[PDB]
């Protein structure tokens, strides 16, 4: 097991009695409504938010993909590889998977284009792909994705999720915040919340039996 949670209650109640045991390389789908507790459950794993009741025991390093895409002043390559070792093939694999090839190629300076003030501002969906690229690049043991497809088109995310979450990271442990039935259809475990309380937990077979 790479990430665990037993009898967890949180106050910034935001999360009430959280229970899950995710094995290595398994995809966990954290679903819920606006305000269910999903964006705060990941803060518990990251250690940003400390709990009141229960314990959280995870192994390895964590790589977060923020719900709100943020661009760092610099190049596209710098936005993806800053602070991490440049592996030519690890880098190329992430571009093709996060659907950034065309987006990059359409530029005069390519992956070297500057995104600061007095430069090139990228669309709400290009910021989202550069941010998920930044995450899937960083070699970690646990991947926390918080609504990575929120500002992305349904055809593109289809291409990202299946070639990124389900292929590129297929042997890495993941936690995806998504409502999409199409995504929960692919998960190993499903956790569903409403105002903190875990309304659902188990396999997709247990869900598709409701």
């Amino acid at each position: 097991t790479e990430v665990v949670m037993e009898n967890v209650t949180a106050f910034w109640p935001v999360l009430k009695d959280i229970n899950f045991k995710i094995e290595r390389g398994q995809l966990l789908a954290v679903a819920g409504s606006t305000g269910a507790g999903k964006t705060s459950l990941l803060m518990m794993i990251m250690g940003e938010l400390e709990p009141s009741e229960g314990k959280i025991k995870h192994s390895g390093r964590i790589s977060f993909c923020s719900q709100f895409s943020w661009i760092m002043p610099g190049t596209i390559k710098e936005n993806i590889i800053f602070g991490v070792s440049y592996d030519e093939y690890r880098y190329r694999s992430v571009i093709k998977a996060c659907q950034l090839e065309e987006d990059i190629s359409k530029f005069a300076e390519k992956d070297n284009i500057v995104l600061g003030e007095g430069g090139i501002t990228l669309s709400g969906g290009q910021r989202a792909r550069i941010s998920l690229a930044r995450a899937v690049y960083k070699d970690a043991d646990l991947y926390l994705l918080d609504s990575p497809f929120g500002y992305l088109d349904v055809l593109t995310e289809k291409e990202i999720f299946e070639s990124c979450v389900c292929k590129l990271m297929a042997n890495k442990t993941r936690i995806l915040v998504t409502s999409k039935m199409e995504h929960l259809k692919k998960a190993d475990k499903i956790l569903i919340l409403h105002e903190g309380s875990s309304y659902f937990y188990g396999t997709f077979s247990e869900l598709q039996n409701l």
Epitope: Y151, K180, L210
Partner: nanobody, 121 residues
């Protein structure tokens, strides 16, 4: 008993405007994201614009500044105000909505496509 219905498409001359529409009828607990897509004759399907529940608007580069999007959360209808049309804008425009059926008990959405309204410039 969940349908996405297109309106507004057809034949126009270059430099003129058009207004598309897309309504979801049926048992709808909630709809998250809505989007307008186009598939050119021969090209792969591509987005034109997308609107979140809150109303955040991402657009394709090929249409920015000309096409505008809007959604009414009470009527479940997404519009695509297609101003300053280019002959290059000619495609079959399709509609998308992440829909939670009232039948469903969990608040979990499903992808729904429209019939696809032909736009010729």
């Amino acid at each position: 008993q969940v349908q996405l219905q297109e309106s507004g498409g057809g034949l126009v001359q270059a430099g003129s405007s058009l207004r598309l529409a897309c309504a979801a009828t049926g048992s709808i607990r909630s709809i998250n994201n809505m989007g307008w897509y186009r598939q050119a004759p021969g090209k792969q399907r591509g987005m034109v614009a997308i609107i979140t529940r809150v109303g955040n608007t991402d657009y394709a580069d090929s249409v920015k500044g000309r096409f505008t999007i809007s959604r009414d959360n009470a009527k479940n209808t997404v519009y695509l105000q297609m101003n300053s049309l280019k002959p290059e804008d000619t495609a079959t425009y399709y509609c998308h909505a992440e829909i939670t059926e009232q039948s469903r008990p969990f608040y979990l959405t499903d992808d729904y496509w429209g019939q696809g309204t032909q736009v010729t410039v």
